[PDB]
From a paper:
Propionyl-CoA carboxylase (PCC) and 3-methylcrotonyl-CoA carboxylase (MCC) are biotin-dependent carboxylases (BDCs) that catalyze the metabolism of odd-chain fatty acids, cholesterol, and specific amino acids. In contrast, PCC and MCC have their BC, CT, and BCCP domains divided into two chains: the α subunits contain the BC and BCCP domains, with an intermediate BC-CT interaction (BT) domain between them, while the β subunits solely consist of the CT domain. In humans, PCC and MCC catalyze the carboxylation of propionyl-CoA and 3-methylcrotonyl-CoA (MC-CoA), respectively. (**A, B**) The side view (left) and top view (right) of human PCC holoenzyme (PCC-apo) (**A**) and MCC holoenzyme (MCC-apo) (**B**). Both holoenzymes are dodecamers consisting of six α subunits and six β subunits.
We incubated the purified human BDCs with propionyl-CoA ([Fig figs1], D to G), which is the substrate of PCC, and determined the cryo-EM structures of the propionyl-CoA-bound PCC and MCC holoenzymes (referred to as PCC-PCO and MCC-PCO), at resolutions of 2.80 Å and 2.36 Å, respectively ([Fig figs2], [Fig figs3], E to H, [Fig figs4], E to H, [Fig figs6] and [Fig figs7], [Table tbls1] and [Fig figs2]). In each PCC holoenzyme, six propionyl-CoA molecules are observed binding to the six active sites of CT domains. Each binding site for propionyl-CoA is formed by the CT-C subdomain of one β subunit and the CT-N subdomain of another β subunit in the other layer ([Fig fig3]). The conformation of the propionyl-CoA binding pocket in the PCC-PCO structure is only slightly different from that in the PCC-apo structure ([Fig fig3]). The AMKM motif in the BCCP domain and the biotin covalently linked to it also show only minor conformational differences in the PCC-PCO structure compared to the PCC-apo structure ([Fig fig3]). The distances between the ureido ring carbonyl oxygen of the biotin and the main chain amide of the catalytic residues G437 and A438 in the corresponding CT domain in the PCC-PCO structure are more than 7 Å, which is too far for an efficient catalytic process ([Fig fig3]). This finding suggests that the biotin may need to relocate to a site that is closer to the catalytic residues to facilitate the carboxylation reaction. The binding mode of propionyl-CoA in our PCC-PCO structure is distinct from that in the ScPCC β subunit structure, but similar to that in the MePCC holoenzyme structure ([Fig fig3]). But the PCC-PCO structure shows that D440, which corresponds to D422 in the β subunit of ScPCC, is not directly involved in the interaction with propionyl-CoA or acetyl-CoA ([Fig fig3]).
Residue numbers in the entry:
A (entry chain H): 361 to 539
B (entry chain F): 33 to 539
C (entry chain D): 33 to 180
D (entry chain E): 547 to 728
E (entry chain C): 547 to 637
Write the structure that this text describes.
Amino acid sequence: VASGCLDINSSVKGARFVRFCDAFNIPLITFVDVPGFLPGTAQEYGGIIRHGAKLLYAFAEATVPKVTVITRKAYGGAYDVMSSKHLCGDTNYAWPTAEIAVMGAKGAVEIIFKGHENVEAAQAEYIEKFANPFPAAVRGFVDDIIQPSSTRARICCDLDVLASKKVQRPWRKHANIPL
Amino acid sequence: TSVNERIENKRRTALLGGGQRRIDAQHKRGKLTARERISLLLDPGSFVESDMFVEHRCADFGMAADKNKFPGDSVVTGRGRINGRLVYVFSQDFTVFGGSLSGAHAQKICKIMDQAITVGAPVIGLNDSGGARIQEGVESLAGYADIFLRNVTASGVIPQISLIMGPCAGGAVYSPALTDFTFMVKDTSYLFITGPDVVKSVTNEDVTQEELGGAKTHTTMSGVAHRAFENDVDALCNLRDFFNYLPLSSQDPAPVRECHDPSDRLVPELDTIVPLESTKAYNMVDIIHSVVDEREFFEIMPNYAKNIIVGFARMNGRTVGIVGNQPKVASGCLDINSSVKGARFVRFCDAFNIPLITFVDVPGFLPGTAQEYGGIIRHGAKLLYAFAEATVPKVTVITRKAYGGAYDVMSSKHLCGDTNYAWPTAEIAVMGAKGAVEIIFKGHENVEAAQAEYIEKFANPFPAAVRGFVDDIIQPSSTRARICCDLDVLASKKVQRPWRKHANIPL
Amino acid sequence: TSVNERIENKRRTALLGGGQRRIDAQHKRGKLTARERISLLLDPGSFVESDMFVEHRCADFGMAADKNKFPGDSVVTGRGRINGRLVYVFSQDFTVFGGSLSGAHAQKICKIMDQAITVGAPVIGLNDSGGARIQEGVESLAGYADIF
Amino acid sequence: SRMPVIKPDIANWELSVKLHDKVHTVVASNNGSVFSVEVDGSKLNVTSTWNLASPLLSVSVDGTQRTVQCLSREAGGNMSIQFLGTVYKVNILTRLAAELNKFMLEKVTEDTSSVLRSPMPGVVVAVSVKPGDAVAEGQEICVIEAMKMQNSMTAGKTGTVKSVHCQAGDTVGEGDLLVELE
Amino acid sequence: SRMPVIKPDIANWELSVKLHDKVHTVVASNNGSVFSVEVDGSKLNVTSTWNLASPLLSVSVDGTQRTVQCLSREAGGNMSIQFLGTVYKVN
Ligand SMILES: CCC(=O)SCCNC(=O)CCNC(=O)[C@H](O)C(C)(C)COP(=O)(O)OP(=O)(O)OC[C@H]1O[C@@H](n2cnc3c(N)ncnc32)[C@H](O)[C@@H]1OP(=O)(O)O
Ligand SMILES: *C(=O)CCCC[C@@H]1SC[C@@H]2NC(=O)N[C@@H]21
Ligand SMILES: *C(=O)CCCC[C@@H]1SC[C@@H]2NC(=O)N[C@@H]21
């Protein structure tokens, strides 16, 4: 549905669910496959920016175990919105088909080599090096790349050891959700 | 070459940033540089720059060439004061790599975010960026995630203000969604995830840069930006004034400032503002301006959701937040857009110990399928929730209408309010006389005669007041005096609530 | 070359670490490798390796050489159990750049240090190092400070 | 007590004060209740109690007794001050703000105060005018009626009516043109 | 209750048991009070109550009643066991 893009309606349902589960100590499992955000004036004038912040906020402030597995696409800012490890996540797994990038090869290469000759040749080299989950994994964004058949076993292992997790946060009268 | 010579050469380049020719273009476009903006914002001489000699550590794409390294890596960070009060700032520099975000870029911003949280000082960001720096790839995506984590952690701890001074694209466009207030500059600043180039390529729609994400769109229609200012100089002058309203941290009480406006004066101008005829509108702002100290009021989103007014003011020196209806627009009814703006404002003021004053004149909710299918129920719960969970002083005055469930939504006393005043023109009822009498006497003869008796008994503020819903009925001219008295004795208020990991707002 | 082939090739190199000839010398001196030591320490099958595909980013003095990259960057990190009880471990691998400490090296150790503190599990370190990795310079000094 | 506040030691205020079409150089310093102000080389001493809330501010300027009223203030330096009965508009910037403000683009928008549009959908119940009728500023022109209220639309321009586009009994939406002034 | 402990599911213990100058291959499994032990292909069943604190441990090995004493134990696998009066060193 809609290539798996984020939009206003999806952010509202997601943020609400994530926040309830965090409040009542229910672990979160995230299955990421998101190419970006739904474009168009229907979303811009609808406050897509203000609404997308709801899902990012709901994950970032969570204190319960968070186990994320990336099954395929994670382009752009949607990578972080869908509970990336740098939002105090516990584990982050990639399948061999995962690809983590600021954008796809077409946008990135035409922008990097803007006005240059033999862009398509440069794109072939770019795809071979970056169109895969490795430039993110080698930097610590991903903890392991697992055979998909083992996903259940890996998650089960993490849930049974993260259940005793406790963290502290600075005191605040109350949270201030972007609304 | 001595080390001192190298240091001086780096200092000179850090000040030029992207170079004099780009600075020249910056001015041609009608924009100030990042350093000029800070000099205007902060008290003269108070700014201390941090990490001015930090450079990127990138190597692919020939980004590790001499003609490619700049000191400061596209952000100016540091600390200073506004009117003697400590504040942390950072400003993005568009002339260096288009203001794009690098790993080191984010790191410097995070550093400021951490010092401000530890000491308890606000952070004001001046944002201008072309998005992620693609030459580094995934390093900039981690940068955004770390900034987002700090912006969430700081929520309810220190005020976070974000002023947009130019275009903003990609992940950068989400930081103003996590801060408390977002301001823009007319015809200069933009907020959007993807540009018109993507909209045209993806879908058959024609749009330009201003239409897609211009300041006028976000302050008038989408409800994203709290206010746009005409130009860079006026934007920072108003920002200094706005800053003076807020505490430095949520651990502090609302600031109190020297005030010359006597607290016990009357405002005779109020007695005749509210018409006796129920179908005649009046400007709620006339009441707000006459009550607040020296008639200064800071209005938020003047062009968005005009049927509800929210803003900042002072009374007897103390900062307060004001919420009220505007009967001139949509009869003063509640709708989706008004509930969103209201709930957000109420929650911020509660988090930072700023008292609330409510001016109620609401006939009900905006009817129609446009609101039903839009989730008016789910959205209206946002304003009721924001008031019900408040623990700061709440002073409500009812100037005229309060029908139906809107009575309780607009901070009624039974939501742990402190005082509730009615003017002689107030009327509190489940609905107006026409609906109530035709329903009660449904199918009966001489309904109009029964309506006359009903109006005489119930079309007034008394059946609610005698039950304890209203504490007093006051001559409107005394409203300011009554509020001032309550604020100066409720300021020491403390209440307890059952422990909860976090709140669960209806969304 | 598919992504799965590249993944398998990285897995095989991560297990060899510094290479079979280095491993041979490791045994000649009477020492076990970092991975053999963990297999002995923890309950069989209980060990889960983290960040096995992380490599250094340092480029200088010919460090940017593909022949200079070693998955794991001289440390084996992960979690397991001893007699059913949760414990976190890490072990330094002497066969990869002499076991010297890099920026990324420390980062991985710190990651283990943070998970163990959050859950409340002991950490057992197996240390073997030649000191700071001078090719990166001051990056390794920050590594030590974060570990400390 | 948690966050000490340090008052900036500002010995001199260097201002650029724009009146009608002239920009004057003014430097002021505070000596308590009296400000010593140099206006393009002329020395003036302005003494007052400076009660900033009163509608009437009494000042003494070099022995000359004046009463002034401050009617409005903006953060951007704009002040409206009534002096000898006449309201003067003055824009006071600091030296730094005035020097950088020259880089701003002088964009000019159109004043369309003759075009009176419906602010709110509903039925038109009264029009106070026909073409040729005199109109004062703030004068009621049209009344709309929705959710049984009487939204009143007033003129922002003095003149006469050129055309009345919507009549009583007509139904109008948001933004529709009601009356056009000369 | 804070840190659940999960007993490893060890169905078989594969041991290398060094005596004087010989190394024997022994595989044992637990069936409650009796260990089924294969010693270089020979099947033995050792039944006891396995009270590990007593100086005298009584065992029954394929119906044969034995009394043994464990005199010392080391983490490195060294055990000193007295069997028929003679102390044997086993690693
Ligand atoms: C989606 C996930 C993410 O968050 S990453 C999204 C990254 N995508 C982008 O934002 C694309 C970048 N461009 C845009 O969005 C718009 O076209 C922008 C740049 C905001 C429109 O601004 P505009 O006034 O037209 O500026 P411009 O295009 O002339 O650029 C000014 C100078 O900055 C540079 N610049 C810009 N963006 C980048 C970038 N991402 N990486 C590197 N450099 C960048 C431009 O090259 C230009 O420099 P120069 O003038 O050519 O010397
Ligand atoms: C085709 O070449 C272009 C597709 C449009 C871009 C898509 S739409 C959804 C993703 N989000 C985004 O910002 N860009 C992606
Ligand atoms: C006229 O007789 C009926 C007006 C419509 C009812 C109004 S609309 C806004 C108020 N909210 C509500 O539920 N009813 C009131």
